[PDB]
Structure formats: structure tokens, C-alpha cells
Design an enzyme around this catalytic site. Sequence first.
Site, short mmCIF file in Angstrom:
data_model
loop_
_atom_site.label_atom_id
_atom_site.label_comp_id
_atom_site.label_asym_id
_atom_site.label_seq_id
_atom_site.Cartn_x
_atom_site.Cartn_y
_atom_site.Cartn_z
N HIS A 105 46.81 24.33 -33.48
CA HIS A 105 45.70 24.41 -32.54
C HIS A 105 45.14 25.82 -32.43
O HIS A 105 43.92 26.00 -32.38
CB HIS A 105 46.16 23.91 -31.17
CG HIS A 105 45.30 24.36 -30.04
ND1 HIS A 105 44.01 23.91 -29.85
CD2 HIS A 105 45.54 25.24 -29.04
CE1 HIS A 105 43.50 24.49 -28.77
NE2 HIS A 105 44.41 25.31 -28.27
N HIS B 17 41.09 27.96 -32.12
CA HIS B 17 40.60 29.16 -31.44
C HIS B 17 40.07 30.22 -32.40
O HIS B 17 38.99 30.78 -32.16
CB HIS B 17 41.71 29.77 -30.58
CG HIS B 17 41.98 29.01 -29.32
ND1 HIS B 17 41.19 29.13 -28.20
CD2 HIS B 17 42.95 28.11 -29.01
CE1 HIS B 17 41.66 28.34 -27.25
NE2 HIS B 17 42.74 27.72 -27.71
N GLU C 101 38.07 25.73 -24.41
CA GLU C 101 38.99 24.70 -24.89
C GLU C 101 38.33 23.36 -25.17
O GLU C 101 38.72 22.68 -26.12
CB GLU C 101 40.15 24.50 -23.90
CG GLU C 101 41.01 25.74 -23.65
CD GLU C 101 42.03 26.01 -24.75
OE1 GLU C 101 42.23 25.14 -25.62
OE2 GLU C 101 42.66 27.10 -24.73
N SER D 199 41.06 20.93 -32.75
CA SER D 199 42.39 20.69 -33.28
C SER D 199 42.91 19.29 -32.99
O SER D 199 44.05 18.98 -33.34
CB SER D 199 43.39 21.73 -32.74
OG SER D 199 43.63 21.55 -31.36
C1 UWC Z 1 43.70 28.80 -18.43
C2 UWC Z 1 44.79 27.73 -18.51
N1 UWC Z 1 46.05 28.28 -19.04
C3 UWC Z 1 46.94 28.81 -18.19
O1 UWC Z 1 46.70 28.83 -16.99
N2 UWC Z 1 48.12 29.33 -18.66
C4 UWC Z 1 48.37 29.29 -20.04
O2 UWC Z 1 49.44 29.75 -20.44
C5 UWC Z 1 47.45 28.75 -20.86
C6 UWC Z 1 46.31 28.25 -20.36
N3 UWC Z 1 45.58 27.78 -21.38
C7 UWC Z 1 46.27 27.99 -22.49
C8 UWC Z 1 45.81 27.61 -23.90
C9 UWC Z 1 45.74 26.08 -24.13
C10 UWC Z 1 46.33 25.15 -23.38
N4 UWC Z 1 46.03 23.97 -23.94
C11 UWC Z 1 45.26 24.18 -25.02
N5 UWC Z 1 45.09 25.50 -25.14
C12 UWC Z 1 44.80 23.12 -25.81
C13 UWC Z 1 44.83 21.79 -25.05
C14 UWC Z 1 46.23 21.59 -24.48
C15 UWC Z 1 46.45 22.65 -23.43
N6 UWC Z 1 47.42 28.58 -22.20
C16 UWC Z 1 48.43 28.96 -23.22
C17 UWC Z 1 49.53 28.10 -23.20
C18 UWC Z 1 50.71 28.49 -23.82
C19 UWC Z 1 51.81 27.65 -23.81
C20 UWC Z 1 51.74 26.41 -23.19
C21 UWC Z 1 50.56 26.01 -22.56
C22 UWC Z 1 50.47 24.76 -21.96
O3 UWC Z 1 49.40 24.38 -21.48
N7 UWC Z 1 51.57 24.01 -21.99
C23 UWC Z 1 51.58 22.64 -21.43
C24 UWC Z 1 51.85 22.63 -19.92
N8 UWC Z 1 51.05 23.65 -19.22
C25 UWC Z 1 53.35 22.86 -19.65
O4 UWC Z 1 53.79 24.00 -19.50
O5 UWC Z 1 54.11 21.74 -19.61
C26 UWC Z 1 53.58 20.79 -18.68
C27 UWC Z 1 49.46 26.86 -22.58
FE FE Z 2 43.95 26.51 -26.55
#
Ligand code: UWC
Ligand code: FE
Length: 290
Positions: free
Chosen positions: A169, A174, A214, A233
Site C-alpha cells: 500500500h 502513496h 487516502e 492499493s
Molecule cells: C490520520 C490517520 N492515521 C492515524 O491517526 N495514525 C496512523 O498511524 C496512521 C493514520 N493513517 C495512517 C496511514 C494509513 C492507514 N490506512 C491506510 N493508510 C490505508 C487504508 C487502511 C488504513 N497511519 C499509519 C498507520 C500505520 C500503522 C497502522 C495503521 C493503521 O491504521 N492500523 C489499523 C488500525 N488503526 C489498528 O491499529 O488496528 C485496529 C496506520
Molecule cells: Fe495510507
Amino acid sequence: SVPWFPKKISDLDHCANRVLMYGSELDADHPGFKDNVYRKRRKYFADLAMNYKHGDPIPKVEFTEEEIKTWGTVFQELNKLYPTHACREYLKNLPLLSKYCGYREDNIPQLEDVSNFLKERTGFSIRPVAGYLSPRDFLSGLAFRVFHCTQYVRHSSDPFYTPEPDTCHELLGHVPLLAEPSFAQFSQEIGLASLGASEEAVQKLATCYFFTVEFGLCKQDGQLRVFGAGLLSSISELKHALSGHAKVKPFDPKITCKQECLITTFQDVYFVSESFEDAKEKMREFTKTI
Ligand SMILES: CCn1c(=O)[nH]c(=O)c2c1nc(Cc1cn3c(n1)CCCC3)n2Cc1cccc(C(=O)NC[C@H](N)C(=O)OC)c1
Ligand SMILES: [Fe+3]
């Protein structure tokens, strides 16, 4: 009182190692939740990020042929869709990454190479991240054109597992747009706006980030195109986004920031930006009010 925020790029050393949920502690519904080998592999990737400090070369990883195959499958299918789905900025930079960073069906690019490419193109760089960070800390990276990036590969058992970000992804979703100056400026200004901002303003910026960086759609030469990395992705949702079964609203931060961010299904609505420059202008007007 303003909360602490990073003042220089090396200060992210103190944000990055504030992981709220580690990448090795998998979701109950994770495909590799019972795979002890995959769990150790995730712990390896998370320790790499945890030990990383700004200034370090990002550790280069020998991916397994199982991991290469999973990337290859995702790579093949998404590339069939990009010409008819992705925005023109995405399509312009993808071939440059195949040339300079080793984007191939049979090769997973290294984050260090991609980071060196982005530094030349837009001054963006990569930092390996060991798991979920607070929205404040994750967005604070963008203020210094740093994208916190996962380095692991999704479980081979389920190669269409989209809920959590993996390196597939990051690299296909990105990176091609972080190499675009107009988009890099848009992303950084989200980062700048959140520095020391209230918890309310951080959450609103996070929601606008979600429905642009995203899951954003943009209008180009009268057509709807995709620029959100989560769509680019995800094979299923990339197709769903530009089909007539999805609801679509114009990007408007004051309305967009009220939208719930869905995790386990397709988005209920996608927001269309007129251009990256216009979205950036809309966020400028919005952040002044928050
Ligand atoms: C601005 C919001 N945001 C944030 O507040 N903190 C981040 O850390 C973050 C993020 N946004 C991304 C980047 C991102 C997130 N996603 C996508 N890109 C593509 C679509 C799926 C979700 N991150 C980095 C990050 C790194 C590692 C894990 C998670 C995560 O969402 N884990 C799944 C779930 N949250 C979990 O922990 O278990 C329930 C995210
Ligand atoms: Fe992302």
C-alpha cells in the site's frame, strides 16, 4: 497551552517511538493471527522501525519469495487498472519509479531507495514505522515532508487484505503522488496545520487527510480519477470508486471533516477534489477557522 510538537526533522525520533498499537500485535481477525512464523517476521519489521533514528539509512530487507509473490500478484492486477482509474499525476510518476527504484512484479522496492528518489523529486522522505501512531504524531511527520511507512508485507494467505497498511500500500498507493510537487505541498500543509493544534483540530485534519490522501477522488478533463492511496492499493475498491454504485460529494473541509472514516468495508462516500492546488486552497481557508 500548546502541546509539544516537533520543531525539526530529527524531533520525529520522539514521536515515532510513541506507538499506540504495535505492528506485531495483530488484530484478532488478521490473516496471520495464528501464523507463528508471520508473527516473528512482523516483530522483526517492528524492531527495525523501533531502532531507527533520523539520519540512519533505512535498513534494507531481504524479502522472502513468498513475500515477493504476494507483492507480484497485487502489482500485476492494480497495474491493469491504473491507466483507466488513476489520476494523471499518479500515472506520470509510476514509470519513473520502475526505472529508478526497481518497481517490478518480481522485486519489492526498498524504502531507502524510494526515500532517496522522493528527496530529489519533492524533498519528501520515508521513515519506517513500527505501528499505529496518534493522528497528531503521524500527521506531524508530514510537516517535515516525512511519510511514516510500514515495511512489512501483508500475509500471503490473503493477498487482498486491505484493512491495515502494508508496504505494498505504501509503495503503490502513496509514493507515486509524494513524488508530485503539487501533492507534496498539499500533504505538507496538512502536517504544518496540525503542529501544536488542539485535539479537535487534529482530528478534523486527520479526517480531511483520510478523504484526500487516502481515499480522494479528483476531476480531470471532466473525468473522475483516483488519487487516494487506499484506493490505489485496493483492487476491489479502486473499481468500486469509479463505478456508478458509489456516492460522491465535492471536497469541502467543513462538510468532509464530519464524515466517519470506515475501516472494515468500502467507504460510504468519496469526496472529489477539483485539483490538488484547489484542495490545498480549500484547506488553507479551513485551517484558519480551526
Ligand atoms: C490520520 C490517520 N492515521 C492515524 O491517526 N495514525 C496512523 O498511524 C496512521 C493514520 N493513517 C495512517 C496511514 C494509513 C492507514 N490506512 C491506510 N493508510 C490505508 C487504508 C487502511 C488504513 N497511519 C499509519 C498507520 C500505520 C500503522 C497502522 C495503521 C493503521 O491504521 N492500523 C489499523 C488500525 N488503526 C489498528 O491499529 O488496528 C485496529 C496506520
Ligand atoms: Fe495510507
